[PDB]
Symmetry: C4
Subunit: 247 residues, 4 copies
């Protein structure tokens, strides 16, 4: 079905390109404070800068390509939309592949651009000292839960009260996730974004957190929105058809 | 009446869950600068980070659940809407109970997540040194007054000039309250948010400020908007019916 | 005419109250970094914090009272609207009186709240070292020019392309003015806001800058918008009638 | 054609004036942290402050003059719109001349205002230490690519899903570009803005980067949007007519 339609593959390519741009811009901002290189200074990360980088990247790329693909740019968001039966299983798989590959490409280009930084961590996500696996998992779950809940509400399509920029809302939710999580885990909140850094650095220590936590958060957001707060008056069996149809 | 309608209890549950998420995200951001734990650094709170955390949390959760409950997430806002006769007394009581319980639950989960921080104040609100009870009370009154005034104006329903995102407006008002009050009192501006920290820490010193000041601010905002700036052409006796009817 | 209409005086009172709230919130934010008092720390002003305080105060108060008065809260903006013949001379005079009195009241209340700060400058505007009168005047002129130009464009009423929140646009313009001018002059950009601090501190040194520069900026913005970029197809004599009529 | 129409020349003058204001405000913000002059302090640039200065300047000036000219204020954006055949070749040339001259005028006025700063670099763009020409070129290409892509999408005119403020979207994209690029290259992304500083300082070292990279980014954004993601159902030959007709 969608496999043979130009619009579907345009959406897949848009997801790939937008994820590449998002990862590159955001992680390049995160690495920015390490320059100048020679200057021996106790330069400290600016958390507001990084959070705004991620959030405004999401907002800008949503404004740019959401009408083409929905501007997921996040495997957790795609999983939320899959479980809320808004996209097909095939579209979800292709979107997640595109997001991961785009994150890998962005992080490789970034490692090329930032070659002067010694021991460049490439914005890899890991637990901060004093934060164990369960605590970082909880932080990741909550950040992804709020992001996916915002996405599910913003695109409900039963709503007539919405006003303003939906891309700005999603970008601000991403910025909020980062403001919460940068100090604890680096704020994965986006399994593809963490995967790119882990792959390029050849370091997967504690990496399962940044896949499991965001997916748990997305699943909980779907549960909360679709079955507790704003249920639909549609038989589940009918909604299941979207998985193999995309309609 | 509303006690037996599924929509009402969905709104109550939405208020509980959204208050939990808001408190957790915001206070976790506020505690973030204390990590890493072992690193002996004179790390200093970033006030813009915390203010944006609170404000963007409110904006995101409003976008997510406002159509379900109105997204009060603040006992002072609920009291403002009660005194402006927009909600019933029962809905106000249930909303405030839900907000307090959600704040308690969020702060307990956070105390679990941040166990590595010694003497974790859990973002408890107290007067800064050089600020006595009356001065902090004034700061709290003004912050809550502007927040409640913005909420009352944004939802006037007599207005045809409104544009953009109402959730963003309310979140930005919350961020403004924090930008004002973090240095003086920690910016309660939200009696449930202060109550959760006070309950979890078992410390209620100067806690009456963070209930009285926000309620005085809400009452003053109601007085200003409903009886000075934008009066309604409706007999007060009719508006009183909403308290026992919710209509 | 308007002298005997309840709506006009409601607008005047709204301008007074909103200017009071704006000045109090913003200058209280600006003074915040001096707390705690006893703590001997080389605490440094956060310019982003103060700029956002001013801008978001303007945005919130515009959302709250613009439909009641237009939410000028700035004598320079009122002068711009007077010279573009949108308000009457009487309304401009009453608005500017209300703005100045509200700024005075806010700064007095703030001086009460911040009594623990020794030598409290109360956010008074003055030239920074290395900035002479002409240079600060230029900074003030440009900041007020951009603010007044944004206000004139946002309320053109010939425009069908506008989208989003006009209050947010004006608040962001104010934030921009502060981001530019805080380091040079303290960013008056609002003669009433500077007047309140000057009156309460009993210090008027270089105060003429913060009245002249903003008025020059407003006049230049009116010239640019109304006579270079977006002229109206109306005889000037007809527009002059608004001064004595307000229509 | 347009050469003899008052609207076209009003648009050109608007581009000149708005570019002047944008450059002045933004670079004056960037130079702000060097004041006070006498105070010997290890004052450090605030990257969030500068990024917001640039972005909010673009947002405010877009709101003010976009309906008059489209508020390009950036030769790279004008080139993107030229290659997407939305403007004529003549309008593009006049706009770029106006933008460059406005940047020069703004930087000259700023050098006058900031005369107390010794060795005033006037916000000139150059490569940071550890960043060679190719790496800075890549940063510039990506920043301009995201900006131009956002502009092309926001003004597609085939879109019915857009909501909120387009000026705010473009300003936030500019802020994102700065958050990415300030630490690497000083954040050009606007060849006129870099040209003004280079001309006033009489320093053109590595200046070709800040013309080539932004134009490559704009060209790639046009390619991506117009030929990969959102193609138009119009013969290229017809679109070429706009270059000599502006229609
Ligand atoms: C979207 C694309 C076109 C933007 C980036 C393209 C160009 C400018 C970038 C991408 C990868 C970069 C290269 C990556 C790695 C290095 C190795 C280093 O020892 C010298 C510079 C060099 C050789 C870089 C030069 C600039 C470069 C070629
Ligand atoms: C919304 C929910 C599901 C997210 C948080 C859930 C999980 C990941 C969190 C919540 C409470 C957390 C626990 C709270 C307290 C402690 C005690 C400490 O000495 C070891 C870790 C441990 C045992 C935490 C592990 C992680 C934890 C179990
Ligand atoms: C909008 C209004 C109601 C909010 C502020 C009202 C109250 C809480 C404020 C306003 C002015 C304040 C007073 C101003 C000055 C001082 C003198 C100082 O040595 C002790 C505290 C004291 C006496 C303050 C106590 C608190 C105060 C009374
Ligand atoms: C848009 C315009 C009107 C705003 C700026 C205009 C005025 C206030 C500015 C622009 C250029 C400025 C001058 C530029 C250079 C210097 C040289 C210095 O040694 C003394 C101050 C002096 C002489 C400045 C005084 C103030 C000034 C005249």
């Amino acid at each position: 079905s969608e496999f043979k339609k130009k619009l579907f593959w345009r959406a897949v390519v848009a997801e790939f390109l937008a994820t590449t741009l998002f990862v590159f811009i955001s992680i390049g901002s995160a690495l920015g404070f390490k320059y100048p290189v020679g200057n021996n200074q106790t330069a400290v990360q600016d958390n507001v800068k990084v959070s705004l980088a991620f959030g405004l990247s999401i907002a800008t790329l949503a404004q740019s390509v959401g009408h083409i693909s929905g501007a997921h740019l996040n495997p957790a968001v795609t999983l939320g939309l899959l479980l809320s039966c808004q996209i097909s299983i095939f579209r979800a798989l292709m979107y997640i592949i595109a997001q991961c590959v785009g994150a890998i490409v962005a992080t490789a280009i970034l490692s090329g651009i930032t070659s002067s930084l010694t021991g460049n961590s490439l914005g890899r996500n890991d637990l901060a000292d004093g934060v164990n696996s369960g605590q970082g998992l909880g932080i990741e779950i909550i950040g992804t839960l709020q992001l996916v809940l915002c996405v599910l509400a913003t695109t409900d399509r039963r709503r007539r009260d919405l006003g303003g920029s939906a891309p700005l809302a999603i970008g601000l939710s991403v910025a909020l996730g980062h403001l919460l999580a940068i100090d604890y885990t680096g704020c994965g909140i986006n399994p593809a974004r963490s995967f790119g850094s882990a792959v390029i650095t050849h370091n997967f220590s504690n990496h399962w957190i940044f896949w499991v936590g965001p997916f748990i958060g997305g699943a909980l957001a779907v549960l909360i929105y679709d079955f507790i707060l704003a249920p639909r008056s549609s038989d589940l069996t009918d909604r299941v058809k979207v998985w193999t149809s995309g309609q």
